[PDB]
Enzyme design. Structure first.
Site, PDB file in Angstrom:
ATOM      1  N   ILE B  67       0.811  -1.219   0.000  1.00 44.46           N
ATOM      2  CA  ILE B  67       0.000   0.000   0.000  1.00 44.46           C
ATOM      3  C   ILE B  67       0.847   1.273   0.000  1.00 44.46           C
ATOM      4  CG2 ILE B  67      -0.353   0.174   2.525  1.00 44.46           C
ATOM      5  CD1 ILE B  67      -3.084   0.946  -0.112  1.00 44.46           C
ATOM      6  N   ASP B  68       1.929   1.277   0.761  1.00 43.40           N
ATOM      7  CA  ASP B  68       2.786   2.453   0.848  1.00 43.40           C
ATOM      8  C   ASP B  68       4.127   2.041   1.416  1.00 43.40           C
ATOM      9  OD1 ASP B  68       2.147   2.267   3.612  1.00 43.40           O
ATOM     10  OD2 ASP B  68       1.823   4.420   3.828  1.00 43.40           O
TER      11      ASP B  68
END
Ligand SMILES: [Cl-]
Ligand SMILES: [Cl-]
EC number: 3.2.2.27
Lengths: 218, 216
Positions: B67-68
């Site tokens: 996601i990040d």
């Protein structure tokens, strides 16, 4: 189960209850168009246009979809050829024969497989002319396939051109495979592995695989 | 090979040519948001936000996506932990160890595996706060991942809740598996790495050799 009336042939549409949410709009849309399509002789006959709406949807996890019925001899059940004569269904059966190891059989029918609903995107064609009724079924076809895709985990469409821009305009999150049509050039359907891929995708969604051998007839 | 300028830090973005089709929009979108990102200290540092755009896409058949970046110590290469310290990559390496039979190793890196592009959906976070920059990267993240999914046969996302949302609008075969820190050992029972190779074999593509990621 239940029934609904329409102002043109076939006059009555009997439907399983899982289809209830869309019947009201189906009637509106069919009445607006029926006059145009009944001018021509059709595959299948008008009494058979909607018999696939007698199937339940809640027990279904895969939809196998073709663009429209056979140019002749459509029975109302997508892909069905009772005398095992049609090329498409012969090629499908061969694919599944090689996949499953079942060598001796007399026919194949998607409609008797647990979890599978076979579907024709357009519900009729002018006799002997494929895609001839696209313009009439357009809104209805979108409506019904959207409803199917709220129940099934995987949609398998057959025909790369036929389903190019129809599946982009379906507006559904459902996992979708667009494979080769059985009569595609250079044996591309024979190398197509969509039947296997379906079961992998189903496994990924915490669903049981389709037993494709259930479709055989002896 | 080529380069493009942008009005805020890191000022220059060097990109492999396979990324050309999206760079023009990337510049527009980054300029319109970079102020918001750079207020905060970030993982990774701004000079490293875009280093993964130096990777080719045409030789890639699988995208492995988180996601990040790591809340701290992000290097610009998704998943990379040079000193093999981060829990995620330690758990990934264990999973591949059991799968491949390679028992002795010192690290693991997705970025040295033929056919794999590791990816962070959002390209930065506020230091120590996961998902903190989601709202800034939104349009850019969608743009770049769409571009990746035109090349790769399989997209493997890690994190069931993180990646629940459809908003990607791509036909690509997609797997959303457990995140490596998921409770009740769910990542350890996750077989997505094997499943990927089955799906690839079904699409007449060579499998990923996951053992290439090991570092000795
Ligand atoms: Cl085709
Ligand atoms: Cl998770």
């Amino acid at each position: 189960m239940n029934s609904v009336t329409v102002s043109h042939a076939p006059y009555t549409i009997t439907y399983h209850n899982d289809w209830e949410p869309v019947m009201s709009q189906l009637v509106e849309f069919y009445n607006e168009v029926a006059s145009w399509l009944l001018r021509d002789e059709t595959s299948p006959i008008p009494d058979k246009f909607f018999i696939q709406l007698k199937q339940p949807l809640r027990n279904k996890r895969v939809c196998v979809c073709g663009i429209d019925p056979y140019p002749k001899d459509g029975t109302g059940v997508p892909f069905e050829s009772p005398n095992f004569t049609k090329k498409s269904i012969k090629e499908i059966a061969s694919s599944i024969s090689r996949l499953t190891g079942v060598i001796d059989y007399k026919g194949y029918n998607f409609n008797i497989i647990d979890g599978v609903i076979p579907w024709n995107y357009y519900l009729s064609c002018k006799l002997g002319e494929t895609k001839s009724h696209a313009i009439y079924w357009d809104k209805i076809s979108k409506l019904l396939l959207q409803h199917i895709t709220k129940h099934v985990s995987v949609l398998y469409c057959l025909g790369k051109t036929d389903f190019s821009n129809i599946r982009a305009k379906l507006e559904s999150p459902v996992t979708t495979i667009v494979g080769y049509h059985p009569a595609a050039r250079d044996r591309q359907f024979e190398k197509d592995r969509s039947f296997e891929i379906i079961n992998v995708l189903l496994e990924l969604d915490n669903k049981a695989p389709i037993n494709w051998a259930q479709g055989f007839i002896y």
